[PDB]
Design brief:
Length: about 55
């Protein structure tokens, strides 16, 4: 499992309210989070499926 899959989700400083997915390693699950539209980190995916494919 890539190390970035352990990062906490990062909304960043933007003002958009975009639904994105992160891998929650403790939950063994991809979960939705709000991304502000800038300054993304790597644990940040378009869908649950893309999160799981990278990290599960």
């Amino acid at each position: 499992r890539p190390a970035f899959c352990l990062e906490a989700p990062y909304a960043g400083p933007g003002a958009a309210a975009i639904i994105r997915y992160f891998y929650n390693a403790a939950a063994g699950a991809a979960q939705a989070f709000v991304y502000g539209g800038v300054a993304a980190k790597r644990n940040n995916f378009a869908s649950a499926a893309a999160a799981l494919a990278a990290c599960a």
